[PDB]
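Schema walkthrough. Field components (list of strings):
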Amino acid sequence: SQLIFPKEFETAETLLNSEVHMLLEHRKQQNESAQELSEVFMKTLNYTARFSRFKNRETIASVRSLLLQKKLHKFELACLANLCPETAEESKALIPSLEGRFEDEELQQILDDIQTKR
Amino acid sequence: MFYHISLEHEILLHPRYFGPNLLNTVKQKLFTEVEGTCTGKYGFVIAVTTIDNIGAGVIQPGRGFVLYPVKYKAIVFRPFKGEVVDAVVTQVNKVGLFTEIGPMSCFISRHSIPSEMEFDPNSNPPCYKTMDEDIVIQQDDEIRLKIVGTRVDKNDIFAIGSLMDDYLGLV
Amino acid sequence: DQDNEIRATDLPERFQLRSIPVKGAEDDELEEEADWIYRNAFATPTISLQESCKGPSTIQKIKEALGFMRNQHFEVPFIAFYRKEYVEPELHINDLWRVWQWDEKWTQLRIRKENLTRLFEKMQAYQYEQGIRALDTTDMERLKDVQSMDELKDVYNHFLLYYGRDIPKMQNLKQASRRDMYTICQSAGLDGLAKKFGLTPEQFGENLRDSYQRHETEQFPAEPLELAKDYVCSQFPTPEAVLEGARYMVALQIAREPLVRQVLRQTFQERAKLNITPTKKGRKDVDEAHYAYSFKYLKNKPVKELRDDQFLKICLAEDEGLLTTDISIDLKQTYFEEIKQFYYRDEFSHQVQEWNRQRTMAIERALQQFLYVQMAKELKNKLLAEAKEYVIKACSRKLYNWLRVAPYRPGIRVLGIAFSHPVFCALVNGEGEVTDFLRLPHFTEEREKKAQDIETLKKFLLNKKPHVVTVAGENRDAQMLIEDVKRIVHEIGVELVDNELAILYMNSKKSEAEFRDYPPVLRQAVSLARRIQDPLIEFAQVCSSDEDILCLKFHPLQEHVVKEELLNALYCEFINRVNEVGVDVNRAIAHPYSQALIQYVCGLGPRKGTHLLKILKQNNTRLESRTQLVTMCHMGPKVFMNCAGFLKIDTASIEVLDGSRVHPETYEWARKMAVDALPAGALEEILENPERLKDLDLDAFAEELERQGYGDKHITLYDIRAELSCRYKDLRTAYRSPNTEEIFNMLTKETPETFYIGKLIICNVTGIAIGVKTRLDNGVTGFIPTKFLPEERVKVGMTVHCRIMKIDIEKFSADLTCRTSDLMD
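Field assembly_structure (string):
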């Protein structure tokens, strides 16, 4: 987290809980157009439909783009963009390794961009 | 949270499927064998996004089965320790809260909650309420939490959670 | 130790073991309890067709009843049997249990209203100290007016929608942002534009409850789009964006208006329909054997048209994954149309037309996106709870019937036969402590060793003298094993007593401690003898644990009802019957077989009973009088006043009244009753003879007790007269013998529904002695008729798909057809 626990996940792309939803529902509408789905996959789809804070693909693409120009660690682009802290303060109370990394000024601006995109 | 890591598998394909569509059978057996397996090295695997390449299929000497090495990109849920994650509470007990982070089932101890909140029996939404019902957590509540200890059973993976940080409450 | 606290205090034990703490009433809270409990539990049309096996004045009865339970802390038995005048005619003992149960619900409702009134108060204060939403006294009025816990959820949701986003209240750990974007629209201040719609939510709720335009739409002299420009911001650039945000606000404020949600709730309660479809798995797995066949498809089935437990089965199918169901108010003239007409202005100007279009589409979003979903889920929960209660009532009736059977009608000596093929047998004492054990391995040559077994049957019947022989119906083998003993009687009666409880006794670890060496079917025969001797004692003994009592089978679906409620219902049936019979404690102080009875006496329970028996083992004395109990056993006046009128004492061990259904507090009157049969001399005067039941002038004693004593003791005097007539007359129905249907059902282990005529079944053809004769796995005889008959066409030795044309319960006829013309349609 703050320091990373494994050695292999750091060079692995991190996904939001809304990229996952649009990828997982794509797999379904592939499947019934084509066997029955997994219990884990279906119930994870229900979980990520519960927390789909961006219902449209281009919104997720824009959110990922914005956080990409912000230049923060690839773990952090998914423990913010789907945690949607509302106050820069909320956000940092959340990421013990984000305080000190970024100044306070851009925090409200980026966070308000996330709550705008929902 | 949900990663996208390339990983490996070895499909032992039986000689029945040596027809014109053996590669499709490799793909189908990858989808059948991989999805749902809660490996502790690589977390939960939810869906196989794509199959990079179906490798050279080595015929096993004396066994008939062909071992196919498959590289594949799959959606992966590995919730690292010290993470703040959005659960969905499924049931309430005296010992704490049993929640569902998605694929993972999670636990919150009776002292892993803020101490201001207490169990409420004899209500068919059995719940942990405060004394003035400022925040009450019944079934199906999108509570944030902090996963502090992740432990592996090699059949399913469960992590434990707490709620002593700012905002770690109902949404 | 909480065990010590329970053992010490003078409350009824189940009062102390209640989740809610017990507290008194002030005759105003008590009247509110009575009226609310009556309206919510005794006169309320169940949505489902609930049949079973009262009146407005019951409120007073409930009133009176509640008084006891809350004030003098009288448990339900002590109220039910003695203070009958205050509750009877209407309040049966089961209705008193229902009053108790709904009291624990009313207490919870007041607790939640109390805290929430408190909260609204603090919030109102915060508001004052502080476009604007006012905590008027109407809010506190509805909060006090709350009657159900469903309304109390509406009021809470209403309060959370507007004033919820106020954490600094506890200031005088922050709130997580709510998922609805209504918070965002309120940050952007669209609520004012939401106000610019004609009606406020409350006025539309009044329109709904009155079904006409009691309030009038307030048109705004402009175009909605032109107001939209005033509000467009970064959050909502387009005027259509602010339009839709305002529509969403109007929808969410209509949804969380308690008047609107209440009226729509009532509409669902009256006019709602259940439509079922099968999933693909349910399009395959559903067959005629599956319980889903009767409803695999359904359309426009009103929720009020359902039956005993249909909805429980429907939800079971939906949980498995077979069915996709939906409860909707409109048919498949929609109820929205009334909503639209109430929220409508008829002015034909383009401005008013556009404002009305916005209003009606916003209220469409309110009705579909918010209200249908929540109210359908709530109605589903209510129907499921109704079905679970039905199942629990069915299990209660099963336990009632099994417990409503008298001991014996020839200390009774009984031999029990329990065939598994090693058959065993055990002989029961006059008090239950087994005398001996014996083995009679009857098997079907060796058809002469079975005659030898019959011979030793006769010899042991000549040696030991049992008044009844009992055979455990376990297979169809006992359908003729009764023949294998009944003629041996000629060299005393035979009864076929079922053995499922005996099977539990076999697997009972407690019984294994009782019988370490006795083989399984031998302990089963023991328990069969104990049951036929007295069912209640054995039921209390073996079913003293949750798993033990639950491992019996009262209903097929009993695994799908709330376990705690089922335990409570079965335990209250146990308590009912135990207190009706009474408990002779000094017998149980030596025989452990009866000990499990004592806990089911009112006031007393699982703790006070063990403490009492251990204390008597400290004195190592016999309880000859209940005065001895109160003095030596040092039992408080309340627990004594509860459990005295039911703890039997054997008089042949000294107030004889201790062996009667006469409470100590009412001893004196009883004496006076015997005095008017002309005390110490009268101890035997009516005991010896019911010389003149017309000697006692009932009305005169009743009016005298009204004038100088305590009034309305009429039925009490009648009870004392009937009790002095016969002491502890058991009212359990005299033990009959199983009818053909009962015998059929036990031996076949199958039910009239599972004996479905039309059922495609498995079968086994053994031998033909005319038509084809087969046997089921149950062992019954299935006759394939000659009319449907050739050896080659139907061979011998294998199994074949077959349909049950005709059945019989005394012949064990299971007639087949096997013709493929029948296997379809």
